[PDB]
Amino acid sequence: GGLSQLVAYGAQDVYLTGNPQITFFKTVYRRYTNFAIESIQQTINGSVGFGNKVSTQISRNGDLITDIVVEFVLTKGGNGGTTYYPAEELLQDVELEIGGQRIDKHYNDWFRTYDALFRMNDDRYNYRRMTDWVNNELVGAQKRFYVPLIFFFNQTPGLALPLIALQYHEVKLYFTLASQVQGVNYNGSSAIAGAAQPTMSVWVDYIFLDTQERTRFAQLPHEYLIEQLQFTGSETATPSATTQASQNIRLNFNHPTKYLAWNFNNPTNYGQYTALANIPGACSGAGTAAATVTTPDYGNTGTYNEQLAVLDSAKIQLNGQDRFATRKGSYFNKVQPYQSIGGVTPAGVYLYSFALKPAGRQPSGTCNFSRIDNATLSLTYKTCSIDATSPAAVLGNTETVTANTATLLTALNIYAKNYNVLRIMSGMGGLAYAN
């Protein structure tokens, strides 16, 4: 039996078994400080509704604060397929403040980009279950939605924010709630009569520590490897026909940056990163005589057909010199998330990393744009010459061309994710460096 493999022991094993350091059949678990975790609701300061801005202040119920989920109760105004990520669509702007200093800020489109890049597998399906109606629910369906926040302290206990160490500083979140949410109170630009206003609550889990560790948090100075998001929007240069437009985006990023991600979108339809086309799932009524390529079949807004995407190529240049040689758009949709994340990315969302493990939190390579005078992202667009209404042309052409309906992707969103250092001492906090 297996003894025969032990007998077949040779010189090549000097590197594998010689003077053993570990064994796989005797694991030793490390003992951990006593703690308890509790789910506590925070109170929302302000009137909740479409287009309103509200805030919340963190109650110091415990020693550290870690995982914040914002809950929405929505009534859909349409039938199945008329909605697409309505919970995070409503959750338009989330601003993180610690002690009077702005620390971070996330947007609904970032939540969709993050879901498009970094959250993967069953976890991404479950995310969609928390943010959408995925079981073909019909008009009038009422559902409770959960949009977990993804700040630096939200996904790993190791970066939990030590409120006991911040007794003199206020921790707040500001929430901008979108005026137009697709399939809930508007269908495209048309208002849905009788749409209900949202109900919102914010739940967060607290960490309670025993005497010795809470004392250490309260009295000792700490540094946390805080991550931040940087964002400003710009317009696209999408051509119509016979030309591939060039565009040079002057970037306004700084700090040691892990990666740059961007998308091309239709600002009217949340999550539309591709052109509409008369192929299955690519537009309303696709495949039938009622098909139209001006309105998506919203619930299937996200696709993987990159021929509906408008990036023919991209190059990043630093201080007048190229950072890498020009790649076609499918490289940033298919290869970089493959090398770095090991997931999928829908068409129209692109990622280039400086980090080898950007999904991780321990540093794995950065580009520090605090020391770079000129950071420019050069884009080449695909020619938008294909008739979107003819599937023979949509599914039968070359890589440098796309649908004529691509000219609707008028907004460009470039996100940068980077490192900073969060300092906490004697009850107060702030950043070590801000640019």
């Binding site: 003894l3 032990l6 007998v7 077949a8």
Partner: protein, 48 residues
Amino acid sequence: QPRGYAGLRPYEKNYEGIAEADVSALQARYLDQTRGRPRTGDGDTEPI
């Protein structure tokens, strides 16, 4: 001899099997006590 022993097909020297007793020994007992009652355990003496 046309060949030297290649070292292939070697043997384990004096390999013993698994030490297994035929006694099915008494299940080892717990170190702590069965927990009882924290509020009124062991009974409360009632006066006459």
